[PDB]
């Protein structure tokens, strides 16, 4: 058991947050001991919103760097913060409010593939394995101590889509354990190894270079496959079948 | 791994269904090989609906007994049917469409606690132990062969609300494994032991009988806690009063 009267602030977006909140409830964290910071209701985030509305769980949508956000966290007074696909950098002074600190879910084997488009870049780079890292948040992104990593094999048929979704599902499976690590004060271990970082641009502008081998082309196609976004171009190429 | 081109129809509602569709995509099931039956857009079922529009997964909200619903199944031609908290009895002829059969998630250890309110009756009866059952669907409700049961211990602090959500959370951790059993044709085992049944109504109309002992009133109060709904009622001098 998590302590009674442990206060938990979830900063999150979409299913992972919904699942976290659900998990917290099954662990016996009462509604008034839960608060959610999120973003406006949208096509990914309206399962979370409808839950918060139905159950009357307190929440904010205010920007991470705003006084209203800080005020929301300060009034709540969290013991721990759980970032579950939160889409902004959380300022240091906000994290400071949580005496038992925090955790974020990142869909790579950190410090490898920090940043954005991680599942795309892993496919493009031809990785045989990737994974997910639950790590403490310090004031920079994805640099804080590792509480839990798990390895996920990348299949030859995986797409950005397939791998993104398996990342979520498998990560949820460890979430209860990680909350319990945070509760017990587990310090985790500092990130060691070859860091890498990727930004918000898809490479080659989403465009196939025909001098690439069949192996580079297929990778790119599979890394670009993510409905409803447009696929790789040559014209619209969602599979290596079509490429031929 | 799931046999590729396996066509899967999910009958469901809310987070369990969203999680299921997420898992299936994570397992490499293509979008045109998924189809969903659900109900009209709800404050519980908003997550799912937006997922289905977003990824353009085909779906219906027609009634389970309707010709439109049956045609939706007919045209999709599922290999398997996954009921994740679907709220109607699915006609037998509709189940016959899936040649690898079906599975439903029920939150008890079947055959105990067939029917609605299983989480509340478990608490009311003073079970220290319950669980969830993934079972094949017969023409009748909650009778078919068991593919997977896991035990969930009940605490003295558990409410219907904490237990309901823990049921969900824990059941999701076994979903992939259940899907693979269906894929590989595990017939499961016949439900053994003595079947108990509980009425569709809310237990004792949510009203505390004062002939009950302290222990039975405590359980009932915990069994009745489920926000946003009304809690246990005590009536005093022909007058309704909600319990804390
Ligand atoms: C960790 C990062 O979170 C957010 O970005 P993210 O890349 O990690 O995750 P999302 O934006 O939700 O996108 C999820 C996946 O959706 C895919 N995707 C995202 N945008 C596109 C796109 O424009 N075209 C194609 N073909 N695919 C796209 C990527 O494969 C990506 O991994 C942002 O809020 C970033 O600011 C943040 N650093
Ligand atoms: N301080 C801090 N904030 C965190 C994380 C962290 O490790 N540290 N992890 C996540 C990082 N993140 C998203 O995962 C994210 C989102 C937007 C931007 C940005 O706008 N620049 C940067 C990072 C969420 N917020
Ligand atoms: N045919 C069939 N449909 C099934 C199940 C089953 O075992 N068999 N399991 C679930 C049973 N269920 C709820 O889980 C459910 C919901 C409403 C009614 C009803 O209204 N008549 C009956 C049962 C979902 N549908
Ligand atoms: N207190 C209270 N709880 C309810 C009510 N309706 C449903 N619930 C709870 O919600 C849980 C699941 O309900 P639901 O999925 O709607 O129905 P079921 O799966 O057919 O029992 C049950 O265990 C109930 O305890 C109500 O009117 N009052």
UniProtKB/Swiss-Prot annotation, chain A:
Keywords of the record: Lipopolysaccharide biosynthesis, Transferase
Known role: Involved in the lipopolysaccharide (LPS) O-antigen biosynthesis. Catalyzes the transfer of a formyl group to GDP-perosamine, leading to the formation of GDP-N-formylperosamine. In vitro, can also function on GDP-3-deoxyperosamine, thereby providing an enzymatic method for producing a novel trideoxysugar not found in nature.
Enzyme class, first EC level, given as a word: transferase
EC number: 2.1.2.14
Subunit structure: Homodimer.
Pfam families per UniProt: Formyl_trans_N
Protein name from the UniProt record: GDP-perosamine N-formyltransferase
Gene3D superfamilies: 3.40.50.12230
Catalytic activity annotation: GDP-alpha-D-perosamine + (6R)-10-formyltetrahydrofolate = GDP-N-formyl-alpha-D-perosamine + (6S)-5,6,7,8-tetrahydrofolate + H(+)
One example of a Gene Ontology biological process annotation: lipopolysaccharide biosynthetic process
Pathway as given in its UniProt record: Bacterial outer membrane biogenesis; lipopolysaccharide biosynthesis
Record family assignment: Belongs to the Fmt family.
Binding site residues for (6S)-5,6,7,8-tetrahydrofolate: 88-90, 138-142
Gene Ontology molecular function terms on file: GDP-mannose 4,6-dehydratase activity; methionyl-tRNA formyltransferase activity
Recorded phenotype for the gene knockout or disruption: Deletion mutant is completely O-antigen-negative.
Domain of life: Bacteria
GO cellular component terms attached to this protein's record: cytosol
């Amino acid at each position: 058991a998590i302590a009674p009267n442990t206060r938990v602030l979830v900063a999150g977006y979409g299913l992972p947050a919904e699942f976290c909140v659900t998990t917290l409830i099954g662990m016996g964290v009462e509604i008034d001991k839960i608060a959610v910071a999120t973003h406006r209701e949208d096509n990914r985030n309206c399962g979370l919103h409808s839950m918060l509305r139905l159950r009357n769980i307190q929440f904010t949508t205010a920007a991470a760097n705003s006084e209203e956000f800080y005020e929301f966290g300060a009034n709540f007074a969290p013991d721990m913060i759980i970032s579950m696909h939160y889409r902004s950098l959380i300022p240091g002074r906000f994290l400071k409010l949580a005496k038992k600190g925090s955790v974020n879910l990142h869909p790579s084997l950190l410090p490898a593939y920090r940043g954005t488009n991680s599942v795309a870049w892993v496919i493009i780079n031809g990785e045989s394995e990737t994974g997910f890292s639950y790590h403490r948040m310090d004031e920079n992104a994805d640099t804080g101590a590792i509480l839990l990593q798990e390895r996920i094999s990348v299949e030859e048929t995986d797409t950005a889509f397939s791998l993104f979704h398996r990342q979520i599902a498998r990560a949820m499976l460890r979430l209860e354990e990680v909350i319990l690590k945070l509760d017990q004060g587990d310090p985790g271990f500092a990130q060691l190894g070859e860091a890498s970082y990727y930004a918000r641009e898809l490479p080659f502008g989403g465009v196939i270079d025909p001098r690439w081998s069949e192996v580079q082309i297929d990778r790119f196609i599979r890394a670009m496959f993510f409905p409803p976004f447009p696929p790789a171009v040559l014209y619209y190429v969602p599979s290596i079948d079509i490429y031929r």
